[PDB]
Design an enzyme around this catalytic site. Sequence first.
Site, PDB file in Angstrom:
ATOM      1  N   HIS A   1       0.810  -1.126   0.229  1.00  0.00           N
ATOM      2  CA  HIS A   1       0.029  -0.056  -0.071  1.00  0.00           C
ATOM      3  C   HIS A   1       0.682   1.277  -0.021  1.00  0.00           C
ATOM      4  O   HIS A   1       0.427   2.445   0.139  1.00  0.00           O
ATOM      5  CB  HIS A   1      -1.150   0.104   1.121  1.00  0.00           C
ATOM      6  CG  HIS A   1      -1.865  -1.281   1.452  1.00  0.00           C
ATOM      7  ND1 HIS A   1      -1.463  -2.445   1.962  1.00  0.00           N
ATOM      8  CD2 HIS A   1      -3.061  -1.499   0.786  1.00  0.00           C
ATOM      9  CE1 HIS A   1      -2.282  -3.513   1.857  1.00  0.00           C
ATOM     10  NE2 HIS A   1      -3.408  -2.817   1.036  1.00  0.00           N
TER      11      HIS A   1
ATOM     12  N   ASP B   1      35.993 -29.124  17.209  1.00  0.00           N
ATOM     13  CA  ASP B   1      36.498 -30.297  16.838  1.00  0.00           C
ATOM     14  C   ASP B   1      37.648 -30.409  15.769  1.00  0.00           C
ATOM     15  O   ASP B   1      37.626 -30.374  14.590  1.00  0.00           O
ATOM     16  CB  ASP B   1      35.287 -30.861  15.819  1.00  0.00           C
ATOM     17  CG  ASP B   1      35.331 -32.482  15.582  1.00  0.00           C
ATOM     18  OD1 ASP B   1      36.384 -32.990  15.417  1.00  0.00           O
ATOM     19  OD2 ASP B   1      34.160 -32.756  15.546  1.00  0.00           O
TER      20      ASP B   1
ATOM     21  N   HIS C   1      38.689 -35.177   6.729  1.00  0.00           N
ATOM     22  CA  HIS C   1      39.541 -34.415   5.585  1.00  0.00           C
ATOM     23  C   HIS C   1      40.822 -35.185   5.085  1.00  0.00           C
ATOM     24  O   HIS C   1      41.423 -34.265   4.415  1.00  0.00           O
ATOM     25  CB  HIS C   1      39.789 -33.093   6.073  1.00  0.00           C
ATOM     26  CG  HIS C   1      38.488 -32.311   6.289  1.00  0.00           C
ATOM     27  ND1 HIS C   1      37.474 -31.990   5.511  1.00  0.00           N
ATOM     28  CD2 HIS C   1      38.196 -31.414   7.314  1.00  0.00           C
ATOM     29  CE1 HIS C   1      36.539 -30.972   5.952  1.00  0.00           C
ATOM     30  NE2 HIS C   1      37.010 -30.941   7.126  1.00  0.00           N
TER      31      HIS C   1
END
EC number: 1.14.12.12
Lengths: 447, 447, 447, 193, 193, 193
Positions: free
Chosen positions: B104, B205, B213
């Site tokens: 509006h 961690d 990894h």
Amino acid sequence: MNYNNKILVSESGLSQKHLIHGDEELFQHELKTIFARNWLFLTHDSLIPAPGDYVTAKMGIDEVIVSRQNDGSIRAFLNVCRHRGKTLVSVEAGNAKGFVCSYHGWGFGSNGELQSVPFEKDLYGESLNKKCLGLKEVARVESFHGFIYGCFDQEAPPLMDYLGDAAWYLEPMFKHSGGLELVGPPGKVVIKANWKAPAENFVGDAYHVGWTHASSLRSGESIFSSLAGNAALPPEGAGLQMTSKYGSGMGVLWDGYSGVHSADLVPELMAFGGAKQERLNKEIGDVRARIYRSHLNCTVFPNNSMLTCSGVFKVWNPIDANTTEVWTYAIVEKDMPEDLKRRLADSVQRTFGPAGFWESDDNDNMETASQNGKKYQSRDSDLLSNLGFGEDVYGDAVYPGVVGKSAIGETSYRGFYRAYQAHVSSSNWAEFEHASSTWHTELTKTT
Amino acid sequence: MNYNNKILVSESGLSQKHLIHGDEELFQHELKTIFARNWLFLTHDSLIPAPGDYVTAKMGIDEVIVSRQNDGSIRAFLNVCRHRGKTLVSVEAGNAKGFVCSYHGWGFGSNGELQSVPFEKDLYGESLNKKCLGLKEVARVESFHGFIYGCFDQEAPPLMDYLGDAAWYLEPMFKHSGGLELVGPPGKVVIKANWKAPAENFVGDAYHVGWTHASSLRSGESIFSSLAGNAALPPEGAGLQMTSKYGSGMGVLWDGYSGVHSADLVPELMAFGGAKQERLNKEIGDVRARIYRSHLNCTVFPNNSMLTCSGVFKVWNPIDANTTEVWTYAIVEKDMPEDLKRRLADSVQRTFGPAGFWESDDNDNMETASQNGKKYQSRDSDLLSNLGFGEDVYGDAVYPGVVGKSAIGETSYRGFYRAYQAHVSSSNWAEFEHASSTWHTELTKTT
Amino acid sequence: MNYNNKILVSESGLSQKHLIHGDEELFQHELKTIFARNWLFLTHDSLIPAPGDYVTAKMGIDEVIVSRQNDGSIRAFLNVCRHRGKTLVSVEAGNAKGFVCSYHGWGFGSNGELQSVPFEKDLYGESLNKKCLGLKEVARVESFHGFIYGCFDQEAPPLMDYLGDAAWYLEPMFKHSGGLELVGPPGKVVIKANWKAPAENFVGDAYHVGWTHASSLRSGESIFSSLAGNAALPPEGAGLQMTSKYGSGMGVLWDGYSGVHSADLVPELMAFGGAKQERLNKEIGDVRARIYRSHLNCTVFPNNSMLTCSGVFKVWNPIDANTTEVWTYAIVEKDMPEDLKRRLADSVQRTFGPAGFWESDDNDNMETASQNGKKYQSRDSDLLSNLGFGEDVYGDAVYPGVVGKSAIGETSYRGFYRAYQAHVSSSNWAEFEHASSTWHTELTKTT
Amino acid sequence: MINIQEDKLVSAHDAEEILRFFNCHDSALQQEATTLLTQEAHLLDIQAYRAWLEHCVGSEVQYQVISRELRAASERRYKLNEAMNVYNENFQQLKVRVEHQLDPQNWGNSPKLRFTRFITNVQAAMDVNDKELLHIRSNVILHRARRGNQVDVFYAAREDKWKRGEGGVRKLVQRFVDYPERILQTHNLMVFL
Amino acid sequence: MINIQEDKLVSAHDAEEILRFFNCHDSALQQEATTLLTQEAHLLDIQAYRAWLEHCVGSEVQYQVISRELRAASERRYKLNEAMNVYNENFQQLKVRVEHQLDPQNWGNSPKLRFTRFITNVQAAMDVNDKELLHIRSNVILHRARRGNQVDVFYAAREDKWKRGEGGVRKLVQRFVDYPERILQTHNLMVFL
Amino acid sequence: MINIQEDKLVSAHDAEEILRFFNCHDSALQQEATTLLTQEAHLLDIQAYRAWLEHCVGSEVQYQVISRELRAASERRYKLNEAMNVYNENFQQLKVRVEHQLDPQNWGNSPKLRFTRFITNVQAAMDVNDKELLHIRSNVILHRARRGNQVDVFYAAREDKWKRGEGGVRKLVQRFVDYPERILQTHNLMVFL
Ligand SMILES: O=C(O)Cc1c[nH]c2ccccc12
Ligand SMILES: O=C(O)Cc1c[nH]c2ccccc12
Ligand SMILES: O=C(O)Cc1c[nH]c2ccccc12
Ligand code: FES
Ligand code: FES
Ligand code: FES
Ligand SMILES: [Fe+3]
Ligand SMILES: [Fe+3]
Ligand SMILES: [Fe+3]
């Protein structure tokens, strides 16, 4: 949440908790207190005109079969087999004397009766009481000039009383024009919005038109083009808003007979409407004849909306709190030339159908407003609907209902949400009526 | 579930119920007790440095607009219109003196004030109290050396006190290096994990690095390559772990300034860090100067994580119990040469961004661990975080906080989940503080 | 919903509330009272015949590893790491002496023992009690002629007692034929149905075959082709239905050894079965030898189904109330020629696998019947299973169990849902047994 | 063709690229391009990443995929980094990623992934100034399936430059993708588009 | 080829269309068609809607997409309107829609949308009676992404008629799509298929 | 090209197939193949299943789609059946399935289904030993829509062998698909890929 006590809509309908657009528990509650209780749009005579004709339709999240009976009446039944509960009919429309279930082959008549059971004598003998095994029937099916509505609740008011003061505004177009027909099939699109967002938008939102649709107005050059980009307020007296006891409401924009339609239909429409209006003057009076050719943006509570003259007809079918299935039909006047009808139908879909360029402007409005109702910091926030409050009247000598005598305002929101709150906190129609005994007094309080 | 009584995290933070990664009721509870209560990362000065600059950000499941004010301050507001609740801003960044709602047309200033309403005089007259209709403002917005955090709870500790003992470890890089900047825009990816899984992974961690990894270490030949396939324990004394009162924690790996970056950046990084470290010796002492050029894997409670030196900066934005939207920025030192900054930024995304080859190793770890929390036989099972327990100290003469003097362990998990349990069972900050009066004593109990 | 009091299945199993196919709360309840309590199909000896062989399987919504031990036994373990809860095994079958977690490298043996922890001496010292950290083991693992079932509840009856009266019907094919093997790998497909819909369909629905599968019957020209389009009732005496105390049940169709298989396998199958039947006459009697070569459509409560002779073997793995993961194996007799076995395996998948043309006929039946259970006006409706009621017997001199001596009826539905209701309202096996003390009397009441 | 003052939604970059393929059509270059891309997609689909590097990728390659920040269509003041690099790889960096895929301890690759690529809308044109540089534009749908029920589908337009290198084999020397989805809903973008 | 009394699932319309491409194959017309459609898709993808109108769309165009009501395969009595028009546009109506896209107050277009089109299965044949009318059939996958996490994918078969107009440029004079999904699950169909 | 000891993720089968299309390129065979597959897809899309059998499928056909069990990349001991057959059809079996589709009591086909196929990445090569056997590889996206809101999309690579049969028409004599998703999320695989 205790729905008896919790204030979801404040007094006079001035504000609503944002969570009503997002809360799944409240959605489930609405299935009972809104959709199982109220009148819901099913179809039109024009879509099932011959005995045996049927369509499927949603009532809330339920699906029903709506069938023209041999005696000319219409009955509606849950689209669910009485045996192991498979969906009976998988099409959207057709003609048939009955419906056979593809699981075990039970055959039901158009009248919902269990008529045949495969190898009944060998298997069931005589112990199967078929007269008790008819399809579950929609309690109430009534017509408003060809438009057919259904209600699961036997205790509901008749459809006419339910339309209340809104009926007066609809009649010039629905009745005195010689009658409307619904052009199907409808477009069907899922939007990620609560059913209440487009419901409220159609019931009373002329405010957004100039801004939300700046681009569509400018591009199509419709009769409302003036309002584009907020370039113009329509003259003081350009229209009004109304609302009613059972929640239905509409905005009126004077003389806008060509409505949302782009410039290619404007001269024909304005000529056609003006011509009928001149004839209608003598039959129903100047005020009502003018109402006929004035643009009405209306919601029939709870989830059926329309734009007369534009010819847009909408069903906001609820799926969950942030999912709605939008059905879009065209409405045309029966005595329009066939070629005009066809072009009007196409134009309704061009503007408000699945690829409607206006309907697309509204999308993000409906979706995000609905989705914000799930966000943690917004759940307990207040949606505002106070525009025009303290200037509404009731019992005016010319225009019935609770009426705001200005084209743009939120009178119809307040009326819509008053009825909504009344139902949500009620267990039956008797309690709604008790909670609605001073409805117009509540809506006109600062006036 | 009664969150006052239910033990989701056992004493000393030794174990957690697996259901905390899967329970949707607990997620909803977290919106109130974790995200509406704590400090959440928003942006950096470098992303909104000029008056009128803004970005959008999530705070929990809420979206906010974060805006640089004319006076140089920053204010943040819910991205929700005060009228009918539409999302105000649909972009991620820009510059503007205000935000206009496309529904509006209500116009809000960068300061959140309701400044204009279309046709206000004609429609609202004077009855619209605009000073009451400003955007809902984030109560608290504070900066930690350019990094801007927000908090919906006015009663929260100041950001510095909230960082507690972790601040000491961050300062050499965040403050004494001459300052960091955040390089945007961030990468953005949805993962099917609970926000707590990568939060805990980054807070403490180091254990998983050599195994999870193995392939990325071997392929990129980063300074941590030694650990690959579990070929090597880092020397006794290779680093330490710490945690703090309000949940923040980090691992320290001595001298690993080139961090996760592949061999193509190793010599430049090690030369640059060593050079600044030599200057810093004289300013902040040898221990802290070394901390500057040592790899810190940190979570700022609850859902902001980072790898200093590597330059990885993460926001784990919660969506539901098994859905998280991961935002990934690069952090660089301001006085790095521009070409080095650019290559560092690219390398951060190469390793940990949307196609980060390290981040992909972690995916199945985070997703399945989170999803198992919904499985019936695992809900009441115990996640273990006891590594290093009974050897943690508090109040050491050199390293502040609850500290494990070994590179690999679960000290930071215990600290993270102690704070998490304390909040989940508390109704406000006063109760958290009461539940945290013996926090370090609880964490050091067998020592 | 109070599951102690709520009548979901009426007396004698005559009807069920439609909501049982749609209610998510009840689904969660089923995880506890149905799937954590009862015997669930895991695998077959033929799939893990050598020490170290393993497969993954679902038990309810949990995943388990099922492993052949060095001593020839089989043990099963939750596929979840005891450390931080990552899924241990990501494949469906293989051979290994152990399973290493890819998160932090914990190594578990095929016997579920925690065997290695990376750098245990350096990190944990001696404080890690590995004997307490074995994988969470499935309490009960038992075999029915090579078919391996598991049960999380130590208090369950042995598998043989649990099969009750159904075992008598299965033995000619499972035991006296010389033994069956399961041909893997299984086809795997998600359907949008409740697990109970195909469970009930296989346990007792011969009624639907002629109608649902009119087209497949006509197209493939299987030995059941007669029933197509409801062209034929099978002769009075064409078979029977049975059910049992613990819910298992089956239909028997006399002599239909070639089963659903299309005409290209009919002569070979009928010749092979008839030949073995003649040998079996002397060993087990004429009645049982005939049972061997008669088509059994069976469900082993709760979610394992099969068609003997056809060789269809199904696992209806529950995902939520309207989602099921369908596993489809072939069963063949060990002493069939290898070429016949291969063609039978292919034909099982051709008819009932992921592109099974019969299985596709059933799809809309299972899906819509299940989804209607969520619809508001159907939740409290009654699914009917009264066919054949009042003519069931118990303790017949020739055929054990509660038996309907007619090929088509709903005897097995009633038995299936009686057991289902008994469990849903019980907290343990003792209570089920108490609620089942007059089970056959309840099933035979009007007789 | 395009005037970006009239065609207000078109970027200068996009209008430049279209001019490249409009002026001259050579359907034989278009056929070389189709074969080149089909064979590249085949190698990637069977996970012959070493073969892809050797046969399809030039030593001077820049392999780049960006994610562009959502900004207002009317924005004109805010001038900070418009995009980040999901990929921005030289040959050596591609090699690292290929090594990562082939490593027996890449746990994410067990069980073996399944890739299916769909290449469409191929256009090809020689650069006007360097007559050995081939411009190829193509669109890809990339379907990746793993671990039973994980299914991720990627959609992108690719702006390539290909050039004859070792033994006269045409190899990729630049790929540019501006990824169309701002927030990825595919778990990651760890696929070679 | 087809007998629709035997091939009971085939519509008369569908059987007619197949006969059109079977009788004569001219792979050069097929190449003109592929280029025509690839360039059209490119212009639409970069949102050069004015260029699309000028270069690809004929003044006499009918651009039509229908949604057909689901009726019983055996239905034979019910004879009310079978379909509604999602699109049924003349050139002027297309122009209105293009103006709507380019308007700076089309709030829905900020931030800028991203389109990627995949055109496949191209067939081309000249009309037998009008030797200047080219029939082209093609299938499209259209991917639309906006506002971070909104992703909508459309799938359709297109029956086109193309004809040489201004300056001998082949332009679209009719497109017909019978959209395959009855209930749209893409928020809207506000895309040029 | 490929050495599968170096390219450790490549199967012997996949490496064999690539060698087939690399050695000799004949873009005219590639065009015959494109037309063949486009017409086959068209017939299947309009559900002319009888026409498909008559015109596209050879009497000696093996039509096979497998689902392969997920096994460890390093697996080397477990040697039980690697795959099951979702399809493994001879001509007679295809005929049964076609009859099943056309039967007026196949309730699942009312209301009529909608199919749209997208064929890409076509490669073609003649067998070296049988000079009448055409090898064609292609990828398909198959979109199936039914009953208002059911939408299923299939993705696959197809290894075909096509051979001239009746009247010199090339027909399919073998199709092999190793379906890339282990657990189907499309309700079933009841579509001709
Ligand atoms: O544009 C819409 O959303 C429909 C609508 C609601 N109120 C109106 C007033 C005038 C014209 C259209 C509308
Ligand atoms: O690899 C990660 O998940 C980030 C991370 C957490 N702790 C770490 C220690 C060293 C290097 C990276 C990390
Ligand atoms: O067609 C099925 O659903 C399997 C099935 C259940 N009862 C049967 C009786 C005979 C043959 C098949 C079935
Ligand atoms: S469910 Fe309809 S006949 Fe059985
Ligand atoms: S919702 Fe924002 S101005 Fe109305
Ligand atoms: S979660 Fe398995 S070793 Fe840590
Ligand atoms: Fe609107
Ligand atoms: Fe990691
Ligand atoms: Fe069946």
